[PDB]
Amino acid sequence: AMKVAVIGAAGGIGQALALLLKNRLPAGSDLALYDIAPVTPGVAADLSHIPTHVSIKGYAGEDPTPALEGADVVLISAGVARDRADLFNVNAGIVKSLAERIAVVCPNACIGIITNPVNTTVPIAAEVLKKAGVYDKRKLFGVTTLDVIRSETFVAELKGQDPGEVRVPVIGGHSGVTILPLLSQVEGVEFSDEEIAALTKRIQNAGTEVVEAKAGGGSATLSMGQAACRFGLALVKALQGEEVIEYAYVEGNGEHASFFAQPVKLGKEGVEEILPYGELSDFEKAALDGMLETLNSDIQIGVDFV
């Protein structure tokens, strides 16, 4: 029986995530929602009327301790969704403050940070945990699953494949040119040069696509909830004893950057083993070398912040 906490539960991402988790967490699970917005207990009440064997509670107020206590997995969707400087000034401090409390209430929890900019918020979290002297790099993750599902959808669409069965690895970071989909590794599929360029570009700018369709009035919230649910369930299955392989931004062996997204074997302690991403085409190797300066910069910004 695992307990999953969703921080920032009142926002669009948070509510989509909470709804899917109430429906998909294994029977007997516990789900805790926290958000300073006073509507939070009501979001939990709303969801508590759904007949699944998953207990749910919601907390508002200025203290997330009730949600964090005994939490096995903590999904951070605090702050505001996405210029670059504004997003950072709001979200960086919010993540740092949460991480500080997480370090004391549930330092053994697996932490999945959804809050952007992920390339930087994960390092912020890591440094806060280190100052507390409880940092376990096997338990800190930047949720990059949205890049993965978007890639599966777009590839499946272009090649008339079943979107539910298509696998598209994605490595690197979670923004702009740092998002590197490994189209060369897609099983059974072959892409032309223009298809590689077109798909890579769309995957890297997919967020903008949604914002524009909303005429500037919002961002990708439902698909982000979907992606975070998928990652959250992967963590929970791993904690319960099943071997799970997933793509995420973690502190690996550091051949390219202190933090880098690649496949990982998940287990009872979080990351069980950092798995090499495999062979890359020339386009992918050039893409990787061309975004490392940006990725390492995003990381330094987070280290310097703490």
Add this chain to the structure above:
Amino acid sequence: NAMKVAVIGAAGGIGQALALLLKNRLPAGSDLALYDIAPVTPGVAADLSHIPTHVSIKGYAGEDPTPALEGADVVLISAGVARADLFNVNAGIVKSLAERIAVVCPNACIGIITNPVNTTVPIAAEVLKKAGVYDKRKLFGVTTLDVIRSETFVAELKGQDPGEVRVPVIGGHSGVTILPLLSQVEGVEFSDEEIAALTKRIQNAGTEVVEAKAGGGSATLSMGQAACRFGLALVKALQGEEVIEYAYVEGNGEHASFFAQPVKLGKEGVEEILPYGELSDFEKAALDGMLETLNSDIQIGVDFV
């Protein structure tokens, strides 16, 4: 064949939850059209289109829902908002929608979520009649949220598996018109105190969520869950599967012209209006006691058209 489901009021809380669940659960090959006056609607569809499920999705914003209604097999209406000004608004919205439906997709199964359902369903029916296309087998007041709430509460109370507990609910969709048939719950025995507590909690569950939301919102996620269940049920039925559901429909009229009870869904919408079974004395007294209220809610709708 593939079915097309249209969600009217797709940008709101209920609507986005419904759309998310439909994108994930509709059978492969399905088409999903989202519509709402809110300018963000096309982006809600775009957001959802990024989910890897074999379900096509499009979104439209504007005053005219025609593109979403065109070729729709199922139309789920969740437009409006959650006193007299508010009713006039939702009534007007439902009336306008029914008018467009009469012209664009008169053969679609219509599921109304927009409250007050007791009144908005008759509004739609009266509009459809005036357009000469009313088919009472295809108009439903979605009362599914009352059913899943009842399932949840009974399960928690008697330590049952929530996914297995069955609790019929008849009557109307608001206050004293909501009648959970706790006497028909198999494998459990309720005390008089529990019967009273459960009934009161089921009838006032909407207020419970509004209060928990500090008065700045109502049930959206659970309502989306409920509408998804009813929506999928209609799709399965249109695809040839015998499905039994609880819904507010124009039945035999033993108690009110529109009344919620079990119905057998088929390829033409309502295939058969089924009896709701035996009632306990408490349930009968509750039924007798809501008649004046339910029929007046229907009257209010008829008067509006």
